[PDB]
């Protein structure tokens, strides 16, 4: 269950718990503020030294 | 029609259309070599329509109380109300029912531009049964045309303005009336009253059409006594206003 | 210039006015909506930064550069002002690689130094950022970028001085290696068993980034 | 200077800010820790557990996601986390088991995604003990 | 080009294109501004505006209007002048230094005089 | 309705309303992009673009201009085609599959021939 | 002959102005809208021809060929200029047989396309 071994950064270690918690509550007391708070549509792309780039992927 | 007017009756005459008349008259005038004015219309062209429309009026009690209504039709060329002929007619009449092709395409039929359409007489000649629910209907629609651009943007709109959009969409959807299908005042009031208060806001903007059908049929079987009282009295007493509201909220509920 | 060409053109300008005039009011709503995400990120920021105050953690004696921007346009001079600040700091250390967050700002620097760019982000200008997204972005900077090795890391964001003026801002991000050499460290009890300095970097890099975007 | 000023804030909402507290109990990596008025300056990493702010009056207890905790020399503890959770009236046993069970099936799914499942198991199990 | 020379033809054309591109974006400028202009477009504007101002020339006959002594420029120097501006060898000099200027040398001269006037 | 049929009128009216809103949002699709449009709007806009291109038809007379063999569509099939497109039954098919095409079957045939 | 090499070319130049006006917004462009934008911008540069300089049919076909296909996409805009003259001189020296077939036949056979195809790619590789 190592997180800093083959898991993710400490930022992600608390992240998984943030969504798990926010999703472990009542569905009635779950404002839309929390919904979009766990939603993201950002993609990253690695570039080279010659303006080159890698295949786009989801964060 | 004046015959009817003079003898103490009521006659409705529709000139469709004055535009064509002027063209005809222009033709005679030019061929006779009379002075040509703006757009090739002789100076007496205005004297023509003014001496026609002024013939219709409302005779006094002593004259016979007779009356002649006029609905002249003018065809503009690309919305150009600034043209010669139209300017003449619009200046003489007592209000316009401006119609736009665009509004027609959207679905709004008849496409009567509320913004431009006006009537100088107004409530003076409108049933009080409908006046009591129409005084406010001009308001909402007015604010709707101002906040119509916001409807194109995301949900980021505040709740205040959003409320207007909810009404306008539905109030505009109610005015859509199929052709050859006139409704009596007894059937208009119930639809306007439910619209103004906002008993349709909860209903989908797609079912507004069938709403009119099923609602009218309801009243004519359970609240027929209310409709008939509005048709005869022509007014809405505090008792009816409450009885009409209760019957509406009941149908909206069961819907 | 015929009556029809002027009537058609005059009509399309009027439409634009309605589109822009409404864009402003709509903007006033997203403005207050970003204040709750701005104050909640500053107050929280002061909580973590308070530690670095009482405990000197300055950097003594390859560099990672991150620029916080959006992807939308029609925002005035925001993609020009920031692209100018990074440009100046780039003249002192050209070797220092850059990882801008925004396809828009990307093209700004992608013309001057298409080499330094080795990673970009897209799809953030939409709504207000959250820690859920911020921590995720900082995560890739440690996996494929390996920011832990870089001696000094710099961040670029726009600090709103007023509703009618902005100021480009820069704030360093001290890494693990810089937490040890901190002159005032002994005053704070700590166990060299749970990689406290190691796990502080991977977290600070997330929050600071979130307070920059928000 | 009497008492200790607490600063419990989140990336979405701030609860306490320069507020005097009698006692606080927040889980640390080394183990469960407590703090009072005057406390030695310690900087520990907070793990997904349960925090409780104490007052002369009945003390409230909220569930924390995780972060860091630092007690400033000037007697000022600062708690930083992501999400927060009220007493119990917020979480539901039924809403937890649904995902909880699905987590064990994530180990069955590809490891890339099962890696995060292992981390969920822990947090979820602790949620059950909060029921008390 | 079969009369004024190949180079003269090319330099002239470049001046037109540059001026033209400024005109085609004029509508945008009054509405949005240069902030909305792209990096490539924003550079052409400034350069363009520099070329336009440079076109002006003090007239000896109109000295009683401009208060500036006439300036007679030869064709040979004029071509080289604009060509040098196109190459981007004077993008540092302020636009004002191109206004009512005779010889290209007078541009750099006038640019230096404006440094002492700045307070 | 009392002439072309009730079904025929409704389908025709829907097509007109779609093409109208499309032309109404022309000021937003260039000034704010396609992303700013709502979920109901984007879905409509895409369709409006498909129907628009679906109105084009190759004539056997102008075969020398388009290079494509004339195509004569029957009214009974025509209405059935747009109807299907108005219901969103072909939101997967590419727009270029509706440009210069006769019957609705050809749309699916074309969309499949391009994929090769 | 020229009918084959340019079929939807006029239609393509229509799309170019469609994309050229839409990229005015100042928004990034994907692979599709930029690909056609790259080619459409060069086709417009290939069409530019000097006065008093009529070009035979055997010299128009080759140029348009390399355009509609996409062999100029990988060339700078200010290069299209000399490219035209250089490419022509190339064929008149080496692949002159082809120019002679296009001229007489006035059409393109399965064989003529093959040779013409290889003659183009071979030149792109040069320099």
Curated annotation (Swiss-Prot), chain A:
It comes from the Eukaryota. Transmembrane segments: none annotated. One of its GO terms (cellular component) is mitochondrion. Pfam families: ATP-synt_Eps. The keyword Membrane applies. GO terms for biological process: proton motive force-driven ATP synthesis; proton motive force-driven mitochondrial ATP synthesis. The modification Phosphothreonine is found at residue 51. GO terms for molecular function: proton-transporting ATP synthase activity, rotational mechanism. The keyword Transcription regulation does not apply. It is found in: Mitochondrion; Mitochondrion inner membrane. Its main location: mitochondrion. Keywords: ATP synthesis, CF(1), Hydrogen ion transport, Ion transport, Membrane, Mitochondrion, Mitochondrion inner membrane, Phosphoprotein, Transport. Present with 4280 molecules/cell in log phase SD medium. Mitochondrial membrane ATP synthase (F(1)F(0) ATP synthase or Complex V) produces ATP from ADP in the presence of a proton gradient across the membrane which is generated by electron transport complexes of the respiratory chain. F-type ATPases consist of two structural domains, F(1) - containing the extramembraneous catalytic core, and F(0) - containing the membrane proton channel, linked together by a central stalk and a peripheral stalk. During catalysis, ATP synthesis in the catalytic domain of F(1) is coupled via a rotary mechanism of the central stalk subunits to proton translocation. Belongs to the eukaryotic ATPase epsilon family. This is ATP synthase subunit epsilon, mitochondrial.
Swiss-Prot record, chain C:
Keywords: ATP synthesis, CF(1), Hydrogen ion transport, Ion transport, Membrane, Mitochondrion, Mitochondrion inner membrane, Transit peptide, Transport. It comes from the Eukaryota. GO terms for molecular function: proton-transporting ATP synthase activity, rotational mechanism. GO terms for biological process: proton motive force-driven ATP synthesis. Signal peptide: none annotated. Changing residue 165 to I: In strain: D273-10B/A1. It is a peripheral membrane protein. It is found in: Mitochondrion; Mitochondrion inner membrane. GO terms for cellular component: mitochondrial inner membrane; mitochondrion; proton-transporting ATP synthase complex. Present with 28100 molecules/cell in log phase SD medium. PubMed:12898710 reports two tandemly repeated copies of ATP3 (ATP3a and ATP3b) on the right arm of chromosome II in several laboratory strains, including S288c. This has not been confirmed by the yeast genome sequencing project. Belongs to the ATPase gamma chain family. F-type ATPases have 2 components, CF(1) - the catalytic core - and CF(0) - the membrane proton channel. CF(1) has five subunits: alpha(3), beta(3), gamma(1), delta(1), epsilon(1). CF(0) has three main subunits: a, b and c. This is ATP synthase subunit gamma, mitochondrial. The gene is ATP3. The chain holds residues 34 to 256 of 311 of the full protein.
From Swiss-Prot, chain F:
It is found in: Mitochondrion; Mitochondrion inner membrane. Belongs to the ATPase alpha/beta chains family. Mitochondrial membrane ATP synthase (F(1)F(0) ATP synthase or Complex V) produces ATP from ADP in the presence of a proton gradient across the membrane which is generated by electron transport complexes of the respiratory chain. F-type ATPases consist of two structural domains, F(1) - containing the extramembraneous catalytic core, and F(0) - containing the membrane proton channel, linked together by a central stalk and a peripheral stalk. During catalysis, ATP synthesis in the catalytic domain of F(1) is coupled via a rotary mechanism of the central stalk subunits to proton translocation. F-type ATPases have 2 components, CF(1) - the catalytic core - and CF(0) - the membrane proton channel. CF(1) has five subunits: alpha(3), beta(3), gamma(1), delta(1), epsilon(1). CF(0) has three main subunits: a, b and c. Present with 164000 molecules/cell in log phase SD medium. This is ATP synthase subunit beta, mitochondrial. The chain holds residues 393 to 508 of 511 of the full protein.
From Swiss-Prot, chain G:
It comes from the Eukaryota. It is found in: Mitochondrion inner membrane. Belongs to the ATPase alpha/beta chains family. F-type ATPases have 2 components, CF(1) - the catalytic core - and CF(0) - the membrane proton channel. CF(1) has five subunits: alpha(3), beta(3), gamma(1), delta(1), epsilon(1). CF(0) has three main subunits: a, b and c. Mitochondrial membrane ATP synthase (F(1)F(0) ATP synthase or Complex V) produces ATP from ADP in the presence of a proton gradient across the membrane which is generated by electron transport complexes of the respiratory chain. F-type ATPases consist of two structural domains, F(1) - containing the extramembraneous catalytic core, and F(0) - containing the membrane proton channel, linked together by a central stalk and a peripheral stalk. During catalysis, ATP synthesis in the catalytic domain of F(1) is coupled via a rotary mechanism of the central stalk subunits to proton translocation. Present with 41500 molecules/cell in log phase SD medium. This is ATP synthase subunit alpha, mitochondrial.
